[PDB]
TrEMBL record, chain D:
GO terms for biological process: cell wall organization. Belongs to the periplasmic pilus chaperone family. Its main location: periplasm. Residues 1-120 form the Pili assembly chaperone N-terminal domain. It holds the Pfam family PapD_C. GO terms for cellular component: outer membrane-bounded periplasmic space. Transmembrane segments: none annotated. The keyword Signal applies. Keywords: Chaperone, Fimbrium biogenesis, Periplasm, Signal. Residues 144-197 form the Pili assembly chaperone C-terminal domain. This is Type 1 fimbria chaperone FimC. InterPro entries: Ig-like_fold (IPR013783), PapD-like_sf (IPR008962), Periplasmic_pilus_chap (IPR050643), Pili_assmbl_chap_C_dom_sf (IPR036316), Pili_assmbl_chaperone_bac (IPR001829), Pili_assmbl_chaperone_C (IPR016148), Pili_assmbl_chaperone_CS (IPR018046), Pili_assmbl_chaperone_N (IPR016147). The lineage of its organism: Bacteria, Pseudomonadati, Pseudomonadota, Gammaproteobacteria, Enterobacterales. The keyword Chaperone applies.
Amino acid sequence: FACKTANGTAIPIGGGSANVYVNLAPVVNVGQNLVVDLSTQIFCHNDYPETITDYVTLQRGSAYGGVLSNFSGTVKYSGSSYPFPTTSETPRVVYNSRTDKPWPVALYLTPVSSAGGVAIKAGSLIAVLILRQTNNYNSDDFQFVWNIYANNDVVVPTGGCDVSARDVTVTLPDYPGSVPIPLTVYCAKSQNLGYYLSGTTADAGNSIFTNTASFSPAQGVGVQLTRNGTIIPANNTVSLGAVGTSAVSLGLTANYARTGGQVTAGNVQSIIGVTFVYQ
Amino acid sequence: LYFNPRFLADDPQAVADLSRFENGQELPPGTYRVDIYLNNGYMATRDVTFNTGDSEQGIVPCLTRAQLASMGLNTASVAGMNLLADDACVPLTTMVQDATAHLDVGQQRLNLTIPQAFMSNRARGYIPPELWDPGINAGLLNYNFSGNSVQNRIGGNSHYAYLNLQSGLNIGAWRLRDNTTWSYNSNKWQHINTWLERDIIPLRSRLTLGDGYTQGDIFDGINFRGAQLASDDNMLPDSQRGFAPVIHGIARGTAQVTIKQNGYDIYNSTVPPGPFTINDIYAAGNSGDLQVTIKEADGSTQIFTVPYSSVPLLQREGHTRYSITAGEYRSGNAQQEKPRFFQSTLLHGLPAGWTIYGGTQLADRYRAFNFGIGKNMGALGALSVDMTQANSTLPDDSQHDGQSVRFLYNKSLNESGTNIQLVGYRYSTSGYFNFADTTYSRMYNLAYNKRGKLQLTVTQQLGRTSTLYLSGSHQTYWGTSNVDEQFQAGLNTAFEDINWTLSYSLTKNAWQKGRDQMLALNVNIPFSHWLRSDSKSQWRHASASYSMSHDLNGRMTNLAGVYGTLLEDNNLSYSVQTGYAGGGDGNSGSTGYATLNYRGGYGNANIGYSHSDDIKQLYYGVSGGVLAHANGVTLGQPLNDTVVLVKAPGAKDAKVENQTGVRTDWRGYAVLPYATEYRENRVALDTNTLADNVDLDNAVANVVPTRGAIVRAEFKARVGIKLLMTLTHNNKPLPFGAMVTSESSQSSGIVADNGQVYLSGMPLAGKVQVKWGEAHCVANYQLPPESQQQLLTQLSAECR
Amino acid sequence: ADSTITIRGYVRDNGCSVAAESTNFTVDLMENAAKQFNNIGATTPVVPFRILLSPCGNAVSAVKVGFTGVADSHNANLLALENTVSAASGLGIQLLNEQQNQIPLNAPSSALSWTTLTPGKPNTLNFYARLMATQVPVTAGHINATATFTLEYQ
Amino acid sequence: GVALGATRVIYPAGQKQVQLAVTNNDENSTYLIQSWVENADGVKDGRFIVTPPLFAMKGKKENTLRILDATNNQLPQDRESLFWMNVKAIPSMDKSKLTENTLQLAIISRIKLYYRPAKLALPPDQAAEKLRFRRSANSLTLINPTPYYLTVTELNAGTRVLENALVPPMGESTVKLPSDAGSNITYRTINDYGALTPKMTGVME
């Protein structure tokens, strides 16, 4: 029995080793299904199909890399389903034709619940399958070591989540005033997350942000941000807890604060940036 | 309360219409229909029937005893409240001393003032259950569609497609949800979840029937199908969810108490003489210790420090949380068997910041008990220890007994130092098996069970901005010697706006051999401080990202990109980056990715091009949600659980404020994509963007939705014209302040001067009635049809 | 910079809050009846009416104080009382500043002079009253007078 | 008694309404406020409309009067018009105490409302830069060629200090310059919001 691949690599009689590269799905989210079709990669034929019948089956299969670290699943062979990575001998396949035929082997791999980042790196071996070939004419047995590798990188969708109302404004009522600002953040994948505020400051404590108005700024007053009735200094990560599909409210309120001496009038304006930090 | 008409004008006749404003102007009608504001705080608006009696206006507005109790009044604090029947009128004027009630028909204000003694103490931010709106009877669908056209050097004819559908119903208080997925490759269906949920408000619990998952706080989070009754902290008040020690104190007199932390005030109040216990302090977490300062009237001050530390498995004093789940077990793997299991977990709080918790798990082939105590040591920190006993049986029908012990430690050393986050140690014996491994197969990763697990988390602060995160996980096994290791370190800094982050990760799996290292650096530079404030710059909000990676094995990867917005209201976002890879496996080239996603009033749409050395794929995706209710079917952005149905018949293209392009649909309806659960939600429309011929009655609405519910936000609009009428009577101007009411609509106005009257929301033609004393005129006015184009209309009409 | 919040809002310089002090008449036709001449009145309606300006603003420097009301037919420089059955004929109210200088009633805006004001501190302005008449007999009874003082800001 | 929110209220052309705060301090009394707009010449022209033209107030809380636009674009576009907004406050009295003879005054406050046409040439902040002065034999004439209404005060020419005056755009305002006045003249202008801009010195044209 002689086995060949799409490339120049081939398995001669008496067994041997060969490497085959397969391009898998490049985009797969959480709970997605990955299919690796080894049938369209290796074709085997019988050396003496006229009188010798070959029995070819997958003896064992070992997963390598992210396939054994960030995925699992099943292996389909002639309709039979076995584990992946495999631990049992696959069903025997009878080959008695001179013409080469595809190997009826495929892999259905699903990522683990901790999927994230590049699941399988391109240019690295994905699995190694050792197949035992036997014939009824004699007791000769051959071992074929097929190294299935990946040519295109596959990155599981970790999940990039944005904040509602980018570039959102608010207005204070008069000098004595207080206004909550609407800012809700949601993420499709539950994870720990925090937010910290940045901007220009006025005092040493980094509490009151400076007034950067252009049309006669009112000196002696600035804008403060409070969460749950508490002053939030700039550059101070605040734990938002575990945020899931249901959006959580940041719960920030805009207030006034005193910076200098005499209080002028006419305009205040402060630019505040917010930035998220994961873990 | 009499006003001299000579002040208003020098004319001897002047106007008698000031007589309506001289006294309290009591409304003769019983149905006041005025919003009630108790203790200067608005509660709700409803039709209130006023009964004749000894009142300031002569009519006492009848209020239900249950309604008063829900508003904040205490039945026990006022004598005679329990004696009166539920349907009997509550005489707050007589039964409650120093109670003032006033009605204003013009302002539609029901001003109620009651003493603070009659009101019971409540936690900050408490919302009465009455204001919680269960929702409306409506369907809901959410569709997401993604597609790929990846092309490679060999076999590049590939086209993948994913279609996720989420259906749901909100019949009454019951909520039903279902999920489905379609996968297309170059047409296999799939099924994920079916479930229903109900909120038991009196028990403050949730009942879930169908598929679901249990909390992983005590036992491993597992996926089940059956009935779950769980207590949630969402229904609790905002200032009472989490862990916060109860503070007791002795006050000599009417003193002022201030508790602060991290150099900032966290709470303050006034305390009458005697003993006071406070438990409304917010869940600080691990910010640091608390400082309590009490200032007496005489000036004496007492200051003391109370430690603060919270392990995740802690509860507030005098609080309980339970979770029971019963039914079949669905692992997600077709090989695993599906048995029946019943799990019940409970956590309870004891004074001096103690917690006790216990969990039971029963099945046909599994029996597990767990009992643990979480003690808040204080200055040292907080620690929780639990011990679990299991009597399991492997698929080979062999019984196995096992024990496990878990230690969790937390501390808050932010007082001139760094505060650790979690130190966890789990130790299991040779025969302790979790519920997952019991049903692997009928008649395998069960060869080795977890023996020792160590988790370490450290957060260090350098300067004001520099932060260092350290995480470490170490896992052993019984029999074998391979150890799983996961280490992560990270430095985060920011000079003014530029963000620097440097990460170093080490990974060593159990079955795999060889440790893998990953050192990455990322720099973010916003293109805002480098440019002046120009309205039409078109380059604002853009930023550049620099990423560098190193596997330490000889592979270099670099990425440089710019991202920003290119639309008027930031409805569009673009991000273009170019990469460069070399070494390692040998593959090298110039990577590139250009993505563009637009969020609109119909549905999000994203298009992305990726170019590499030999791989190129095109992402095209569209996502959107649809809501079906009694009034019709409205499209919109993907509805994220709680959603508010903005209703405004009359405003066609009105835009919701403080939202990313959420515009009203063609009929005027709209759906808010993200809404906060169990909290006050404010919805406001930009009146500037509203039609010039339509004026909104109110531009701000408040709604408090429950989770998984749809809440209507009413917004009434008037499409009438604004008119400046010059009414004359007997060839003379009308008196000052004569009240004019339109018969066609509900509009009304007051005479300004020289017989001029301003009316809003008036039709092209119609009749009005103006009265000042004891209906003097009934006038009519017809205008040309072309007057609708004009913003303002001025005309004159007499009376008979 | 995932999202930027632009806080905005103006602060306005508040004006001066003024509350007039009601002037009560308690002559009871004592001096007016004794005179019975009405040539220069009887100075019965004499009182130090005080107007308190507090709390004022930060930029309020100078304001204009004027008077206006119903001018007496008999004397153009005096304000007549409100006509009534019990109204005292031959009696009208006249006002003068702290320097005992009569302030014309219903005077033009440009006629009045600027009055200084201490910024940021409470202030009180005291003006004297007097009774005037030209030719009429005293009728005693109640006396009602209506007048308004204009506080023109800068 | 009644405190006005702002001493100066501005009105830009093309806008619909403007808001003015009114607060009460004498919580023990009830004050009724009526508002009206008046032309510079003194006539009661109804070119501006106040939506709550007359209403009472009890206790101590703040209300927001509203000003509309009813000019129909019938005003010059090269100059900002001037109007007077008047708020008249009338107090209350006890019914029993009304028998006793007494005289009660009324609170009326006047403020300047500027109707500013859109598309202004000179910058509103930089409008104070332009100023011209002419010294006569016994008087001083100030002329402001800028298309803005400039209010000047603290006019101190030398040791003597001239009385404050208001100048109109495209015109000259004359004041009585003292005989013993100095050469240099110091003036302080008032901006739109009411803040006191720093002092500046000018030269004769």
